[PDB]
Every structure is written in C-alpha cells, then in structure tokens.
C-alpha cells in the first residue's frame, strides 16, 4: 500500500490517493490536486464522470508490480491503511470517527495482498460509518454503492 | 399567368423526394441517436 | 529439456530452438538457420506466418519419444532452464535480466515434465520481463499471448 499508494497535492497538501490496479491507474474525479510522481503527471487521463473518476494507462515499468485485482467478496474484516473496514450486508462500514476528509481514493486490501474496493466518502450513520465506495462483481461489474446522504471524502 | 405560383406544389416529387430522404435522413440518425443513449441508460442500470 | 531440444545454428552462432512436441517438430520463423539433427533436415516445414512458426511431422523412430503439450495451466510457478517462470492473470512474466535473444522456441516446463508454452519473446519491463509466447487452452485451442512492446528474441 505504502510504496505502491501516491499522494495528490493541492497547494502543498494531500488530499486524496492514486490507485494502480491491473496495469491502470485510476483517480477520483472530485479530488482536484497533481500527481506527485513526475511520470505519472505525463499519463494522459479518461474520465468517467457519472463513476466520479479517471482512469489511464500506466507507463512499462510499473505496470507488473501493481495491486492484483479481485472479485470474491466474502463479508467479514478486511484490511485498510486505517485498520479493519467491516464488510456486511453488502455494505462497506468504519467505525464512526476515523476517516475523513483526504482519504478518498485509499485502497481497501485483502488478506492475500488484492484489492476489494477504493474509497470515495463516507456517511456517519452515528454508530457507524458507512463508506460510500465502488465494489465490483462476479460479472465484472463495478457498481458505485453509495448510502443515502454519502458526501465525498 | 392565368393561376398563381404556390410554394407547397411548385416542386417535382422528383426533388421532393430528394429533400425529404435528405432530411430524414438526420431525423432518423438523431432518433437513433437518442434511443442508443436510452438503451445505453436502461441497460447499465439493469446491470448495474 | 535438453534430451529432446535441439539449436538451431548460423554461422556456428546458435539463434533459435526447435521442439518435438505430440510427436510433431516446431520451429519458430522469426530466426533464421540450419536444425542442427539430420533426420529431421529432410521434413517439409509446412508455415503457419501468421503464428511466426513452422511446423513437421518426424519420423517414425522417435515419435515415440517426445514432449508432452498440457492444456490446464495451474497458475503459479513453472519449469524453465533459467529457472522459474511466474504465471498469472493469463500472462507469462520471469524476473528481469533472465532471457535474451536466441532462446526463442525454449519449452515452458512444469512439475510432471510437459510442456505448458513455447517462448517467442519477451519485453523488458524493469521490475520483471513479460514473456510473449504461445499457449494452449481447455478447447483445443492454441492462442497467442503478446504484450506490449514484445520484441522477437
């Protein structure tokens, strides 16, 4: 997560994460800010708008050492750069307090190293808070799950 | 000129025709156009 | 592997290997040069360009000894001369500096001794190599698999 996960900067502070998947880098649309790695700034962009976010084609070198994809959804715990994100009733949930705005684009990660969802916002239901994020499905589908009153991170 | 020149029936059915499958033809094209887009719409939302 | 691989020469400069495999002789088109057996110098090379190769039907005597194609691919770790190659998402990758020109042709080995692929070439990527070759599939179906940037080796 770490070496692979790059800041964005906005007038010299983050704001949001850019996510490598597959062989190709994807961004939040709402986030505005630059790519902090100099490469990566030349990649031309193609935006879904209706997803909130732009996709691109990743340069060579970097393609092969990227976040292995997955599909397999089982609910339980999964892990997050934050901790342990709760998988339930088709719902991704945090507990009520920890993330916020600068976290949008932050991978969620499996247990074996594979990617579950990417992070857009979240909605504080005052016990939980359930993260407005786009999970994909068996169909290669990828469904933007957003609960009511979500506002962007 | 014992009758007066009209606009409605002043042109052949030859250019007639020509007109109106010209026009038709973007009537047509931008129809389709738009159910494409509904289809599109409806689709992705059954699927979603 | 090195029983039933046999180079081809040019100008006493080894470019390429052939294969016997189902009891038929392969050899890839993009190198240029003599087989280095002389039995099987008299068989017809019938061309599939298309697929950068020809291939023969060998004699009697030796059809009986011969590699063996597979068609499931487990994915993972398979045999190879300079060692193990890594397989997944459908694509052939090896760690980087290992290969080069003249290994084209070189079967992909496995733990029962089969053959699982044939190397054509492979593209440098810097964190690993992307290994373009041809592979076999659950229908009887023989596919290329070529990344970006694959050079002929």
Known sequence: ESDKTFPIMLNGQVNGYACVVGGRLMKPLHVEGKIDNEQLAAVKLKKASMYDLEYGDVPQNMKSDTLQYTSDKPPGFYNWHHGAVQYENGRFTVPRGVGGKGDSGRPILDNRGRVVAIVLGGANEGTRTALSVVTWNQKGVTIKDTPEGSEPW | ?48
């Open chain 2, 1 to 48: 000129h014992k009758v007066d020149q009209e606009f409605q029936a002043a042109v052949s059915k030859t250019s007639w025709n020509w007109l109106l499958a010209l026009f038709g033809g973007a009537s047509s094209l931008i129809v389709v156009g738009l159910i494409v887009l509904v289809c599109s719409s409806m689709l992705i939302n059954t699927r979603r």
